[PDB]
Design a protein around this motif. Sequence first.
Motif, PDB file in Angstrom:
ATOM      1  N   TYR A 922      40.229 107.704 -27.877  1.00  0.00           N
ATOM      2  CA  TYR A 922      39.653 109.051 -27.884  1.00  0.00           C
ATOM      3  C   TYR A 922      38.995 109.528 -26.586  1.00  0.00           C
ATOM      4  O   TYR A 922      38.724 110.717 -26.433  1.00  0.00           O
ATOM      5  CB  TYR A 922      38.640 109.164 -29.024  1.00  0.00           C
ATOM      6  CG  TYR A 922      39.211 108.795 -30.370  1.00  0.00           C
ATOM      7  CD1 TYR A 922      40.169 109.600 -30.985  1.00  0.00           C
ATOM      8  CD2 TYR A 922      38.826 107.621 -31.012  1.00  0.00           C
ATOM      9  CE1 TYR A 922      40.732 109.245 -32.207  1.00  0.00           C
ATOM     10  CE2 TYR A 922      39.383 107.253 -32.234  1.00  0.00           C
ATOM     11  CZ  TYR A 922      40.337 108.068 -32.827  1.00  0.00           C
ATOM     12  OH  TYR A 922      40.900 107.700 -34.030  1.00  0.00           O
ATOM     13  N   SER A 923      38.730 108.611 -25.658  1.00  0.00           N
ATOM     14  CA  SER A 923      38.086 108.975 -24.394  1.00  0.00           C
ATOM     15  C   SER A 923      38.846 108.526 -23.149  1.00  0.00           C
ATOM     16  O   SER A 923      39.544 107.512 -23.154  1.00  0.00           O
ATOM     17  CB  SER A 923      36.666 108.405 -24.337  1.00  0.00           C
ATOM     18  OG  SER A 923      36.023 108.743 -23.119  1.00  0.00           O
ATOM     19  N   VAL A 924      38.701 109.295 -22.078  1.00  0.00           N
ATOM     20  CA  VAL A 924      39.357 108.986 -20.812  1.00  0.00           C
ATOM     21  C   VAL A 924      38.435 108.075 -19.988  1.00  0.00           C
ATOM     22  O   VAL A 924      38.816 107.545 -18.950  1.00  0.00           O
ATOM     23  CB  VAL A 924      39.648 110.288 -20.023  1.00  0.00           C
ATOM     24  CG1 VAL A 924      38.559 110.548 -18.982  1.00  0.00           C
ATOM     25  CG2 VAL A 924      40.998 110.208 -19.396  1.00  0.00           C
ATOM     26  N   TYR A 925      37.210 107.906 -20.469  1.00  0.00           N
ATOM     27  CA  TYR A 925      36.219 107.073 -19.810  1.00  0.00           C
ATOM     28  C   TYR A 925      36.604 105.600 -19.906  1.00  0.00           C
ATOM     29  O   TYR A 925      37.230 105.165 -20.878  1.00  0.00           O
ATOM     30  CB  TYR A 925      34.873 107.286 -20.478  1.00  0.00           C
ATOM     31  CG  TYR A 925      33.726 106.563 -19.825  1.00  0.00           C
ATOM     32  CD1 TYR A 925      33.247 106.961 -18.576  1.00  0.00           C
ATOM     33  CD2 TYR A 925      33.069 105.517 -20.493  1.00  0.00           C
ATOM     34  CE1 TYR A 925      32.128 106.340 -18.006  1.00  0.00           C
ATOM     35  CE2 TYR A 925      31.942 104.880 -19.940  1.00  0.00           C
ATOM     36  CZ  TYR A 925      31.472 105.292 -18.693  1.00  0.00           C
ATOM     37  OH  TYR A 925      30.365 104.666 -18.131  1.00  0.00           O
ATOM     38  N   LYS A 926      36.236 104.841 -18.878  1.00  0.00           N
ATOM     39  CA  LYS A 926      36.519 103.409 -18.816  1.00  0.00           C
ATOM     40  C   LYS A 926      35.243 102.648 -18.486  1.00  0.00           C
ATOM     41  O   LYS A 926      34.829 102.553 -17.333  1.00  0.00           O
ATOM     42  CB  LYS A 926      37.575 103.096 -17.750  1.00  0.00           C
ATOM     43  CG  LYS A 926      38.985 103.447 -18.134  1.00  0.00           C
ATOM     44  CD  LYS A 926      39.929 103.218 -16.957  1.00  0.00           C
ATOM     45  CE  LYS A 926      41.372 103.624 -17.278  1.00  0.00           C
ATOM     46  NZ  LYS A 926      42.257 103.552 -16.076  1.00  0.00           N
ATOM     47  N   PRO A 927      34.586 102.109 -19.508  1.00  0.00           N
ATOM     48  CA  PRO A 927      33.357 101.360 -19.267  1.00  0.00           C
ATOM     49  C   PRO A 927      33.659 100.067 -18.507  1.00  0.00           C
ATOM     50  O   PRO A 927      34.754  99.523 -18.592  1.00  0.00           O
ATOM     51  CB  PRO A 927      32.837 101.105 -20.679  1.00  0.00           C
ATOM     52  CG  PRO A 927      34.114 100.960 -21.481  1.00  0.00           C
ATOM     53  CD  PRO A 927      34.954 102.095 -20.936  1.00  0.00           C
ATOM     54  N   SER A 928      32.683  99.573 -17.764  1.00  0.00           N
ATOM     55  CA  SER A 928      32.871  98.337 -17.025  1.00  0.00           C
ATOM     56  C   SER A 928      32.552  97.202 -17.968  1.00  0.00           C
ATOM     57  O   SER A 928      32.065  97.422 -19.071  1.00  0.00           O
ATOM     58  CB  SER A 928      31.921  98.264 -15.832  1.00  0.00           C
ATOM     59  OG  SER A 928      30.601  97.920 -16.235  1.00  0.00           O
ATOM     60  N   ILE A 929      32.805  95.980 -17.532  1.00  0.00           N
ATOM     61  CA  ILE A 929      32.522  94.832 -18.377  1.00  0.00           C
ATOM     62  C   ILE A 929      31.020  94.783 -18.616  1.00  0.00           C
ATOM     63  O   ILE A 929      30.570  94.464 -19.710  1.00  0.00           O
ATOM     64  CB  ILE A 929      32.998  93.492 -17.727  1.00  0.00           C
ATOM     65  CG1 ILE A 929      32.694  92.317 -18.660  1.00  0.00           C
ATOM     66  CG2 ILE A 929      32.318  93.296 -16.356  1.00  0.00           C
ATOM     67  CD1 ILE A 929      33.276  92.493 -20.015  1.00  0.00           C
ATOM     68  N   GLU A 930      30.254  95.080 -17.572  1.00  0.00           N
ATOM     69  CA  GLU A 930      28.808  95.046 -17.668  1.00  0.00           C
ATOM     70  C   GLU A 930      28.260  96.100 -18.620  1.00  0.00           C
ATOM     71  O   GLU A 930      27.300  95.848 -19.363  1.00  0.00           O
ATOM     72  CB  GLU A 930      28.181  95.216 -16.280  1.00  0.00           C
ATOM     73  CG  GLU A 930      28.437  94.048 -15.337  1.00  0.00           C
ATOM     74  CD  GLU A 930      27.287  93.804 -14.369  1.00  0.00           C
ATOM     75  OE1 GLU A 930      26.138  93.694 -14.848  1.00  0.00           O
ATOM     76  OE2 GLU A 930      27.528  93.713 -13.141  1.00  0.00           O
ATOM     77  N   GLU A 931      28.844  97.295 -18.580  1.00  0.00           N
ATOM     78  CA  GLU A 931      28.391  98.375 -19.459  1.00  0.00           C
ATOM     79  C   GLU A 931      28.682  98.021 -20.916  1.00  0.00           C
ATOM     80  O   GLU A 931      27.856  98.248 -21.803  1.00  0.00           O
ATOM     81  CB  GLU A 931      29.051  99.709 -19.089  1.00  0.00           C
ATOM     82  CG  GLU A 931      28.456 100.892 -19.797  1.00  0.00           C
ATOM     83  CD  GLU A 931      28.898 102.203 -19.193  1.00  0.00           C
ATOM     84  OE1 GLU A 931      28.591 102.424 -18.000  1.00  0.00           O
ATOM     85  OE2 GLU A 931      29.541 103.011 -19.902  1.00  0.00           O
ATOM     86  N   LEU A 932      29.861  97.446 -21.148  1.00  0.00           N
ATOM     87  CA  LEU A 932      30.262  97.046 -22.489  1.00  0.00           C
ATOM     88  C   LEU A 932      29.302  95.972 -22.964  1.00  0.00           C
ATOM     89  O   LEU A 932      28.915  95.943 -24.120  1.00  0.00           O
ATOM     90  CB  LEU A 932      31.679  96.467 -22.490  1.00  0.00           C
ATOM     91  CG  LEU A 932      32.849  97.378 -22.141  1.00  0.00           C
ATOM     92  CD1 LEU A 932      34.113  96.563 -21.973  1.00  0.00           C
ATOM     93  CD2 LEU A 932      33.010  98.390 -23.234  1.00  0.00           C
TER      94      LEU A 932
END
Length: 1073
Positions: A922-932
């Motif tokens: 649903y999103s074009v955003y790509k969280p980093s490993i750290e954010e996840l």
Amino acid sequence: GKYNLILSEYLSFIYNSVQIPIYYSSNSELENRCIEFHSKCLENSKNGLSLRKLFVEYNDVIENATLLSILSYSYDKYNAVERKLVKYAKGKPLEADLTVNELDYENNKMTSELFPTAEEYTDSLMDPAILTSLSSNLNAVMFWLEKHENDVAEKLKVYKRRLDLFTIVASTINKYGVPRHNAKYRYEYDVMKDKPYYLVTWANSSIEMLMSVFSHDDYLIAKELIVLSYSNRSTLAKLVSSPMSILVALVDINGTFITNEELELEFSNKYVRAIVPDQTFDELNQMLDNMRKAGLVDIPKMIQDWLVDRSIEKFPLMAKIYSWSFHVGFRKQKMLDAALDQEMYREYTMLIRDEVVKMLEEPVKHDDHLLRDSELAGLLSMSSASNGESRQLKFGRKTIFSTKKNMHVMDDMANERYTPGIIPPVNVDKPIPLGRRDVPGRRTRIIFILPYEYFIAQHAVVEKMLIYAKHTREYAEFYSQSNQLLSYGDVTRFLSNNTMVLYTDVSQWDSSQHNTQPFRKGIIMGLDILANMTNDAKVLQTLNLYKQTQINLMDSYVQIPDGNVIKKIQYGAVASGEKQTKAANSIANLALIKTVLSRISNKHSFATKIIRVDGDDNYAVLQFNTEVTKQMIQDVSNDVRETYARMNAKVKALVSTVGIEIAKRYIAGGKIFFRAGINLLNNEKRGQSTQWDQAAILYSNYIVNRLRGFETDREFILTKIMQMTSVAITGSLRLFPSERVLTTNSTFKVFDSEDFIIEYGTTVDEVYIQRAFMSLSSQKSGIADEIAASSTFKNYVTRLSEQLLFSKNNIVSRGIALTEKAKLNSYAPISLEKRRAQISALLTMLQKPVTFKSSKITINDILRDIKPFFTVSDAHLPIQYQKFMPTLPDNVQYIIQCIGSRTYQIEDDGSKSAISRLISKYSVYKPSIEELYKVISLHENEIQLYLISLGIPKIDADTYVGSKIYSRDKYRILESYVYNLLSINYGCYQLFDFNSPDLEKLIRIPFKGKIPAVTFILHLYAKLEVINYAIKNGSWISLFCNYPKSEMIKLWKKMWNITSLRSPYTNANFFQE
RNA sequence: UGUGCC
């Protein structure tokens, strides 16, 4: 700990007419003694007295304290090199044979004869581009020579072979004197004009080559390359490493490793006879003759001697030569010269069109969000590189100029100029600025630096294609989490007496002018078909824009500098620079290989076991309904070359039944080989990295080369590291960091105390130092905060955020603003301020370590807590796996023989998590490993808000927040994060199968609670400890763990609060790939 | 600010 001892000898050797040790201790009383000792040494030196009494007096400081650095009070004038050089400069100097290179300027002429006026001078064709001096390199070799002057036996032979070689370097350099460098390690015109143009680069390559000499063969090889290199600067590397492609076909297969259903390496004891047509032998001979015509003698003979029997056992020499040539330096032509070189494609074009349609068919019909919001995706993705032109930009109240892509987009938006709907031209009206890529042996290729409109209009589609490739095996470079071993395995698999392999290097075709028409049309035709599949307005515009970029390129023009002027010429060929570069090229090669194979069959009837495209190469394994003969190979090969020939394609096709040789790797005798030609004392281009980063990088290059089969003496590397990582206080005061400062896992780590073994502080002093270094990790930059507060900047962050998420902003918002504040780091002025701040902070830290409130946990802390809960005991593991990667050093090889290797990469981005996948849908955003990692560990209610804020629907978000999968995700995200902090996919570890049953037995861990995170860390720590011991002692041990139950709960809390360290060592691994 | 795409 020999690094510290080595540094003193080197310093003593360099300066003679004092050194002041500097210690420190985590024990208040001891530290005071360290302070007292430092004061006394300075006072004693100031009075020209002996420090021998003080050392005895402060025996305790030397014995227990930890050396931090060394003070160098040298009062000379960075001379000594001229004086030192002469004793080694006796042999006859070398004379440049100014008649071996086609293009005049590629000959070792006198600088003046090349550029008569100081305004016509340019290092653009010889700039070592490295941040270390020629004088320093020379100093390093001499120092090593002095130390190993009184050695005996085989060690002596190494010194003697080396001593002879450096004699050529010393004498030739002396005839003109040692060139002097400026403040930016560059060589200007005044020093240069009296000396031969390529003198400085050549000396660097020879020195690098000689310090990598051991056996007599190394000595013979280094000497030929060195003498020849001084004259030849454009075909020596190519001539030397060309016979290799022919060689792989010759060697027989006696037991190799193949790929099994589980896609893992399995041993096969089969035998495959090498079949070679007499014609091929003539071709090899022509190659050998060519080497000879170029003055070569020793190298040609070695290949010829080997040819009598072609034993895979005496093959390492051929491998050694292939790695060696690359070390002659890079071939840097003149932009124009690099640029200048440049009815039946109906079948070829159609396949390219069809392949393009498949990769997006499903995405297009459904109406994928990423395709719909492609413009937004490009902005987030956007880099900080160049856009082409240097623009004047105003930020808040500061008027400065930048070329950066990120800066241009922000300025343009704040002026209603931002217009991605209009894809700028690249023809005669708006020519394309050029970029260049240099490599040893091959020719220089140009690079387009197109406007950001192009990156944005192509970013979403290329990403979709890559995902399709990710699960299509034809694309070796993109398939799954595979490494090069699996690819190596696939070729061997179907090899037998009724099948022949077909390898081909199509590097020349990719650049061809014949190629661009069919290529652009094929992508475009595909785009039209995809468009006739949906009705979504957002999808069509994004899809349409991609079509427009292809059309503009069809007719392009380039700005090639011709001196100091910029000639606008018509470039009618495909150059790299686009986003779709790699994906499109992969599609084109595959379409091309398929086209040649189909045409050939009309004549021959075979079976296609495997087809592949990997980089600039492409190959296949065919199967015939009979036994292959020498005659059969000639017929298949002639027809295949002819098919390529008809398409006006200039390529090199070869047919064998045992091995193959492509740019990335080569296979001979069932064994996998990898070239080891990374340059050490010379680079391709300059950047914005510091001396420390470069020093860390040099060590890395050394490690990869050492792993691949090209070793450079460690003492020399250590010596280089000492010179590079030094810091001047004044014009006579230089501070050299200690081994502990250099090797500890901190934000300033440059190399490992012991190769192939990453240690972590298990002592209090190391911990004290580690905490202190982190203290001053990030430094402020005025110029940076300025723009970070300007209007245009905040609006850019705000516009992206209000376009992305719905509900509330901050976990996402803080990241976007920061992610955007860092991109400013490409702007030198900001980069320069940061470095100056780091050095001043660093000078004080080395001088007298500061205090720190700590309060921050890391990987080292987690490991330290565990350690005291394991019991060691000698164990034993026999060798079971035959060697398949020969070049590997002995200690590394032994671990593989005993426990095995792997054919995959351990997921370290968390992309394989359900939540990450949900965000993607649903999103074009790509969280980093750290954010996840931060996000997963949040209170159930918080996670639900975060998913919705990004656009995730409520029924979906609610279902995840409580499911079994979310609980599993928690453990999975941490496992990915922990592997990342331990660089399990880099260096030497990426090879070992950490899930090996044999390795597994050596670990004994009784459960006393049961909690995923805790169990995973203990097993991983145990596995690393057992392997590391194996690397150092060549023998194994077993590990028992009796970790408390109460202790594990405390440990788990510690685990969900780990911080990531940033250091030159870390950067270097990222830098490699 | 000796500057150079993916």
